[PDB]
Amino acid sequence: FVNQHLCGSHLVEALYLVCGERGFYFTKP
Amino acid sequence: FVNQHLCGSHLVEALYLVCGERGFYF
Amino acid sequence: VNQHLCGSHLVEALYLVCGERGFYF
Amino acid sequence: FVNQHLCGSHLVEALYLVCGERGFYFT
Amino acid sequence: VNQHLCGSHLVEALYLVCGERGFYF
Amino acid sequence: FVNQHLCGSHLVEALYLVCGERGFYFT
Amino acid sequence: GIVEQCCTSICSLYQLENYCN
Amino acid sequence: GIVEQCCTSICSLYQLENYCN
Amino acid sequence: GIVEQCCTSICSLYQLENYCN
Amino acid sequence: GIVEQCCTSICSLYQLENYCN
Amino acid sequence: IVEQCCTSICSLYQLENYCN
Amino acid sequence: IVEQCCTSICSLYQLENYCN
Ligand SMILES: [Cl-]
Ligand SMILES: [Cl-]
Ligand SMILES: [Zn+2]
Numbered sequence: 001f002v003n004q005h006l007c008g009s010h011l012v013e014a015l016y017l018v019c020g021e022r023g024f025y026f027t028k029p
Numbered sequence: 030f031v032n033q034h035l036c037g038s039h040l041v042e043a044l045y046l047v048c049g050e051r052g053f054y055f
Numbered sequence: 056v057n058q059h060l061c062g063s064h065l066v067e068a069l070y071l072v073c074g075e076r077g078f079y080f
Numbered sequence: 081f082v083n084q085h086l087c088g089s090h091l092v093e094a095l096y097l098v099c100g101e102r103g104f105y106f107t
Numbered sequence: 108v109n110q111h112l113c114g115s116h117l118v119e120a121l122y123l124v125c126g127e128r129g130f131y132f
Numbered sequence: 133f134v135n136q137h138l139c140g141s142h143l144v145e146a147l148y149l150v151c152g153e154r155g156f157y158f159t
Numbered sequence: 160g161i162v163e164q165c166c167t168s169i170c171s172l173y174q175l176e177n178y179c180n
Numbered sequence: 181g182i183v184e185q186c187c188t189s190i191c192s193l194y195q196l197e198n199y200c201n
Numbered sequence: 202g203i204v205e206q207c208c209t210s211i212c213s214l215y216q217l218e219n220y221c222n
Numbered sequence: 223g224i225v226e227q228c229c230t231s232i233c234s235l236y237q238l239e240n241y242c243n
Numbered sequence: 244i245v246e247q248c249c250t251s252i253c254s255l256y257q258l259e260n261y262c263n
Numbered sequence: 264i265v266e267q268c269c270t271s272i273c274s275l276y277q278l279e280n281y282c283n
């Protein structure tokens with residue numbers, strides 16, 4: 001799961017630059 | 030707001046390494 | 056110099072927001 | 081892919097370095 | 108080079124999970 | 133300093149690069 | 160759910176937004 | 181909420197985990 | 202130089218967007 | 223060397239931990 | 244250099260050459 | 264290196280005198 005993971009890394013770098021202020025809930029299944 | 034932002038960045042890098050399946054709020 | 060390292064995040068956000076676009080440094 | 085998205089983010093970073101004043105540029 | 112890059116996330120998760128120590132290189 | 137943390141996240145990432153085999157240590 | 164939904168393939172900035180509250 | 185919580189000063193791994201459901 | 206502008210205030214998603222090529 | 227080991231399974235947090243000086 | 248250097252590693256007489 | 268190199272900048276002839 002090396003790579004779900006190198007990724008979920010850069011995803012979250014990213015929801016962040018983006019939900020700006022309303023933010024979000026992150027279910028990893 | 031340059032440097033908050035340089036930083037929210039290095040943050041959510043790090044939430045993720047760490048919550049892994051339960052999800053998160055806030 | 057900050058400018059030699061912002062130079063480096065800028066070089067990277069520029070690199071996610073700029074998506075594919077790139078940038079001159 | 082999420083994988084090379086990730087590698088470029090890396091070289092941008094190397095040239096900034098060798099060249100100096102002299103600079104360098106990245107596409 | 109995954110290895111020279113995971114070598115650099117790893118020199119960085121190693122530089123984040125490893126902090127000051129440095130690492131053998 | 134989130135700022136030199138953030139600069140060394142960056143030099144490590146740099147000598148990894150200059151010395152090559154010979155390595156270099158980053159200490 | 161979002162991972163099921165963004166790791167293998169890149170999510171841009173909008174999608175990423177439903178999952179916003 | 182979390183920003184306020186981690187930007188000028190370095191956040192280590194466990195803080196980060198509360199915000200977890 | 203940009204070095205001199207975004208490294209000087211933040212740019213919204215909307216302002217970075219400004220040095221991109 | 224390291225590059226050899228974590229770069230193959232994830233290392234839970236547990237396994238990265240092995241290369242630090 | 245993404246590809247010269249994302250597939251094998253590059254020297255500095257070599258990255259010298261990528262300035263100015 | 265942080266002197267010759269984080270507040271000004273080092274060149275690599277100079278970063279080379281830092282290798283093994
Ligand atoms: Cl990577
Ligand atoms: Cl930085
Ligand atoms: Zn990476």
Ligand SMILES: [Zn+2]
Pocket residue numbers: 035060063064138139
């Ligand atoms: Zn940085």
